[PDB]
Paper text:
We identified and characterized a canonical 14-3-3–binding site (site 1) within the flexible, structurally unresolved N-terminal APN region using direct binding fluorescence polarization assays and thermodynamic analysis. Peptide 1 (NKNANpSSPV) proved to be a strong 14-3-3 binder and was further validated by specifically competing off a fluorescently labeled RAF1 probe. It accommodates a canonical 14-3-3 mode II binding site (site 1). As the structure revealed one 14-3-3 monomer per asymmetric unit, the biological dimer is generated via the 2-fold crystallographic symmetry. All residues for APN 39-46 could be modeled into the density. A superimposition of 14-3-3 phosphopeptide complex structures revealed that peptide 1 was bound to the common phospho-binding site with the identical N- to C-terminal orientation. The structural analysis of 1 bound to 14-3-3σ showed the expected orientation and location of the peptide within the protein and allowed the modeling of the 14-3-3 dimer bound to the complete extracellular domain of APN. For the binding stoichiometry, we observed similar values when comparing 1 (n = 1.05 ± 0.02) and 7 (n = 1.13 ± 0.18), which implies that one peptide binds to one 14-3-3 protomer (or two peptides bind to one 14-3-3 dimer).
However, the exact mechanism that leads to APN-driven MMP activation is unclear. It was previously shown that extracellular 14-3-3 adapter proteins bind to APN and thereby induce the transcription of MMPs. The family of 14-3-3 proteins are highly conserved eukaryotic adapter proteins, which are involved in several hundred protein-protein interactions and therefore a plethora of cellular functions. 14-3-3 binding occurs usually in a phosphorylation-dependent manner, in which a serine or threonine of the target protein is phosphorylated and subsequently able to bind to a conserved basic patch within 14-3-3 (21, 22).
Author numbering:
A (entry chain P), B (entry chain P): 39 to 46
C (entry chain A), D (entry chain A): -4 to 231
Amino acid sequence: KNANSSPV
Amino acid sequence: KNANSSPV
Amino acid sequence: GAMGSMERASLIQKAKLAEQAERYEDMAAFMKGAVEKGEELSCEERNLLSVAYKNVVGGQRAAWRVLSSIEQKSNEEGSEEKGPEVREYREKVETELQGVCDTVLGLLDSHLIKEAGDAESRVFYLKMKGDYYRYLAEVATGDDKKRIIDSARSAYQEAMDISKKEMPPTNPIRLGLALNFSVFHYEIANSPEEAISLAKTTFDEAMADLHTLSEDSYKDSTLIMQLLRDNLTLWT
Amino acid sequence: GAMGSMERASLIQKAKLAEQAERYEDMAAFMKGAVEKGEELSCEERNLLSVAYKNVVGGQRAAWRVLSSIEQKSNEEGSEEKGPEVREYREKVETELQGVCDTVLGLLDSHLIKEAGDAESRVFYLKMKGDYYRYLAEVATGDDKKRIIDSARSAYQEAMDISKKEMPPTNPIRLGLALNFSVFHYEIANSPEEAISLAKTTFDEAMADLHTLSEDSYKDSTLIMQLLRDNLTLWT
Ligand SMILES: [Ca+2]
Ligand SMILES: [Ca+2]
Ligand SMILES: [Mg+2]
Ligand SMILES: [Mg+2]
Ligand SMILES: [Mg+2]
Ligand SMILES: [Mg+2]
Ligand code: NA
Ligand code: NA
Ligand code: NA
Ligand code: NA
């Protein structure tokens, strides 16, 4: 994955 | 898992 | 629906068991059944719904990325022709991913968003709507790509407007929304400067509000703030 | 079958793509379609078939163990009554696991084992037959439990007899068969001494044959020998 996104 | 088994 | 005969409470109970068993497809089907009972979802139930579908689509997205990479390499100069199988199988995974996104968007439209009056629930669902249009955008190539992107942008923007008016800057859903909207700007909308600006401002406004929080709230907020910082480290 | 219209070679190609994408349910469906073309499987194709179903059932077994543990705790003294949901959902996962095992055993019986004349293919398939009866045995509780256990034992025993006559003690399939039959003795047949004896003798006879092997064969054999040693460390 290219970037961090929200866990929820 | 209780023990090691074969990878194939 | 196949869950129509099961009690709402039993569906929620089984969604929690499926999570413990890492059976996320089951978890999503149980939570879909719960949504289709027609009652609003509690905070914990909204989290179960999101976790379930996040894991299902997350596996699909990872597979799609593997297959798209193979497909791209097959179209490079000097690459041996291997027939239609790579494209076919990428399309298979893509169509299944699109189907899950359509299912989630369908639940949000029937009728979770309409009945969400509190800021926390409305922002949560509008963020979800942005997220699943963003996942659709990751694979879109046709004449609907611009419309998919604008649908994600529109949902995120409405969520941002409510969240800024009604929630503290440290609220974990506000933070996760800003995080995801910033990723949308960087990865989808070809707007890295907007992505970086949003992550920076979001981080700084949360930092200034940490002093108001209990130890446990502090931990929840700093967890998401660290993801904003991680992205800024990737991007700058 | 749903794969009836796809070329055998395309099914094998897509099984390899599914493996790269960690899409093991797809991988298993592709390999089932390939088996159902009616031709024998090459060594590489047998490995793809096994890897695919091993991963599918492995996830099911892990989920079943989580749910069975929760169910067992619910039946302890002082545990609050929570209704039928834990049992129902354990049964759901159990029935799906049994269905996959039945599918694999069906492929072995129609007609992979019958047409396997070479030692390597026949031992591979008989080991698989033992394995999937062993997975059925892990969840069996009724009046067929003894028959399921004996079906696993019978398949493993036939594979052992052929492997001892026709394959070197370092052959990775012979080693993996002995490893799994030893686990069957320890975990299923309540025969820990037999399990330990088999693992020891298998390890020692392989050690004595390593000198005959190339560097790459040596690596393949010692990988499985290490699993025998790991089990002996657990068991002694
Ligand atoms: Ca396909
Ligand atoms: Ca169930
Ligand atoms: Mg009811
Ligand atoms: Mg309402
Ligand atoms: Mg043909
Ligand atoms: Mg033959
Ligand atoms: Na091809
Ligand atoms: Na508020
Ligand atoms: Na209950
Ligand atoms: Na031989």
